[PDB]
């Protein structure tokens, strides 16, 4: 019922006069729809959904101008952080930036995001209230000052509360069956085993959208973290996503253990059991 | 501290190139070129962030180009100048985090088909009236810069070799002499009003002073009258108890 | 398009003037008031945020909903005389000025003493000029140049030291002939204007 627009930005410095790598990708929910990439030989914002391709030369020229503005801004941000931390000319460093909105079942909701990370650590991030900043170290405390004194916070909101939502909404409409579908998990189980007095149980879940999903594992109605081999939810690459949850059990004790598949696109949670 | 532009005025002949220089506030990353024609608001030309030139408008032709080779000073360059190019060319440095523009005093480019039309001002001071003093016990000096082209001069009042503004009025904008004529030169009046007691001190010195903005050293001229170059034209007047 | 009141605001001192401005794109996130003296550059008055920005005599609000920003000068002062310029970003970082709203603040002449004196040139009476002074703000001045008689509109003059402010207008002729009590015959003179017995 909830949705999200989010842009992800990745700037990497390249020692010795080299212009940095810059990658920008735009997601609506869990579905990438645009990318910029300094490496690639278009040097325009490229469409990566098929539903955003209908937008006219105006929008594209438009986004391109902004992404080229964003790129140059991050080339500078790199130079600046190298300065703040007194790091050297000879290291490569990484600025990551994510901003975007959340909407509700309503589509007229707000949660706003705009945060940074330098070399894998958090740097500065706009708090939930959208008027305040959280500043990691002194170096970030410098940026907090600049951005309080400049009223950056209040300028963000005009986008986060405004055009972000408006265009999120606009996209969810045109996306149609793509963006607003809720593909259900096809689920089953396995019994491969490399012992006599042990046995392995895998609770599979394939071909589901959106990505978010819950694969609990209870012994006789009590959740178990112990032995519960859970992998990151992975993309099948067709648009759906995959996730399995393993548990090792002793032989002849698999009549006890039950799976629990919660997903957004299910009528009720699907309790599961091994079958001879 | 602020943004600084050179030159402040340039008169140019139709089809000559001009080059405006701008030296901004260091700390501000962005630098903006705007252009203003009398009566309209400032038109965007192009903005930089450091050496990078992110955007430039439809309005900026082929002829117009602007560099900022380091993060610092920028130049605008207009080629094969036309009369339509004539405008105030405004340079502004700008915060990236706020959007605050901090303008220089601009470069006035006036482009003419030839320079024959360019005349400096005649400056006359006119002493107060006894009529005015016998009624008001106040004395208005009048200053009259007449027959100059083009219309941009700067007129100031100097009492005892100190510029003062208290009790001065200058015409907000100069005045066409032949409103019907295209070639019409422009004229400007100013007023310094002081206590009749002050005018009735003979050891009191009044100068009205008009900075004309005309032609340069390297401007071409073989016409019988004097070269109409950027000059200060003054007019003098002394106190009297009669 | 940044649009703002076209019509010039001519008001007397003490008055309260309100400027309206509106921007087309909802995209804009940065909003400004600039102020510009006639023959000079634009200067920042005010960054415009939602919280009621209360300067001295100046207050501005922003209505993102109706994409509209305003300005309210409380006690009008002679020195508030300038074109007030509305500025927002457009699609990018780039900043775009509205056409401007001109403000002229007249002074309030409490003891008008309308007059037309004649003055003579310090060098050998090179010309002859007349000064129409000490008149009431509402008095408009027009001119006929079919003899070659040039006239300058109202011009306010503030003797800070003694708190005296006075309107004034100048007229003159190049030719030997003159008409000093006939210069402002083309304008709407105050009924009790003083043309003193010539010197």
């Amino acid at each position: 019922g909830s949705h999200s627009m989010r842009y992800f930005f990745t700037s990497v410095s390249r020692p010795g006069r080299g212009e940095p790598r810059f990658i920008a990708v735009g997601y609506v929910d869990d579905t990438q729809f645009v990318r910029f990439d300094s490496d690639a030989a278009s040097q325009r914002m490229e469409p990566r959904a098929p539903w955003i391709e209908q937008e006219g030369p105006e929008y594209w020229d438009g986004e391109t101008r902004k992404v080229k503005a964003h790129s140059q801004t991050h080339r500078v941000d790199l130079g600046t952080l190298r300065g703040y931390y007194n790091q050297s000319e000879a290291g490569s460093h990484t600025v990551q930036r994510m901003y975007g909105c959340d909407v509700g079942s309503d589509w007229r909701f707000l949660r706003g995001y705009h945060q940074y990370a330098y070399d894998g650590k958090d740097y500065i991030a706009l708090k939930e209230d959208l008027r305040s900043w959280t500043a990691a170290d002194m170096a970030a405390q410098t940026t907090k000052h600049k951005w309080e004194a400049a009223h950056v916070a209040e300028q963000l909101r005009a986008y986060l509360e405004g055009t972000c939502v408006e265009w999120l909404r606009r996209y969810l409409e045109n996306g149609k069956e793509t963006l607003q579908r809720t593909d259900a998990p096809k689920t089953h189980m396995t019994h491969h085993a490399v012992s006599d007095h042990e046995a392995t149980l895998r609770c599979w879940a394939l071909s589901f959208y959106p990505a978010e999903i819950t694969l609990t594992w209870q012994r006789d109605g009590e959740d178990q973290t112990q032995d519960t081999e859970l992998v990151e939810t992975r993309p099948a690459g067709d648009g759906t996503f995959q996730k399995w949850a393993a548990v090792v059990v002793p032989s002849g004790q698999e009549q006890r253990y039950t799976c629990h598949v919660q997903h957004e696109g299910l009528p009720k949670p699907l309790t599961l059991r091994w079958e001879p | 501290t602020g943004v600084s532009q050179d030159p402040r005025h340039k008169i140019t002949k139709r089809g000559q190139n001009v080059t405006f220089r701008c030296d901004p506030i260091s700390e501000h990353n962005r630098l903006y070129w705007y252009r203003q024609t009398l009566g309209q608001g400032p038109e965007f030309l192009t903005y930089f962030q450091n050496e990078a030139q992110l955007e430039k408008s439809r309005l900026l032709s082929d002829r117009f180009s602007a560099e900022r080779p380091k993060g610092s000073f920028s130049t605008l360059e207009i080629q094969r100048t036309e009369q339509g190019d004539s405008a105030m060319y405004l340079c502004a440095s700008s915060s990236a985090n706020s959007g605050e523009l901090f303008f220089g005093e601009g470069s006035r480019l006036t482009v003419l088909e030839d320079l024959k039309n360019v005349f400096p001002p005649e400056v006359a001071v006119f002493e107060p009236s006894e009529a005015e003093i016998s009624h008001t016990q106040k004395a208005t000096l009048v200053c009259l810069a007449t027959g100059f082209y083009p219309d941009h001069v700067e007129l100031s009042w100097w009492v005892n070799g100190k510029e003062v503004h208290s009790g001065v009025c200058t015409d907000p904008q100069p005045l066409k002499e032949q409103p019907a004529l295209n070639d019409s030169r422009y004229a400007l009046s100013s007023r310094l009003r002081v206590s009749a007691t002050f005018w009735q001190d003979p050891r009191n010195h009044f100068r009205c002073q008009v900075q004309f903005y005309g032609l340069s050293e390297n401007d071409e001229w073989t016409q019988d009258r004097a070269k109409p170059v950027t000059q200060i034209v003054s007019a003098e007047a002394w106190g009297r108890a009669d | 398009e940044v649009e703002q009141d076209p019509g010039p605001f001519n008001v007397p001192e003490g008055a309260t003037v309100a400027f309206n401005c509106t921007y087309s794109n909802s995209a804009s996130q940065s909003f400004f008031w600039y102020r510009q003296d006639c023959r000079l550059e634009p200067k920042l008055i005010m960054s415009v945020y939602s919280s009621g920005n209360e300067d001295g005599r100046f207050t501005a609000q922003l209505n993102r909903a109706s994409q509209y920003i305003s300005l309210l000068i409380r006690d009008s002062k002679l020195s508030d005389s300038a074109t007030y310029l509305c500025v927002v970003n457009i699609n990018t970082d780039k900043l775009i000025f509205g056409t401007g709203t001109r403000l002229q603040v007249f002074p309030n002449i409490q003891n008008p003493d309308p007059a037309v004196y004649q003055l003579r040139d310090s060098k050998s009476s090179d010309k002859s000029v007349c000064l129409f002074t000490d008149f009431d703000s509402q008095t408009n001045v027009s001119q006929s140049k079919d003899s070659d008689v040039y006239i300058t509109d109202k011009c306010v003059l503030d003797m800070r030291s003694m708190d005296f402010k006075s309107n004034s207008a100048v007229a003159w002729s190049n030719k030997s002939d003159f008409a000093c009590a006939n210069a402002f015959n083309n304008s709407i003179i105050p009924e009790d204007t003083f043309f003193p017995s010539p010197e």
């Binding site: 986004e63 964003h70 600046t80 952080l81 703040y84 600049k146 055009t163 | - | 699609n91």
Partner: peptide, 9 residues
């Protein structure tokens, strides 16, 4: 639709 305004650290 990208944010129109960019900011420096």
């Amino acid at each position: 639709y990208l944010q129109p305004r960019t900011f420096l650290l």
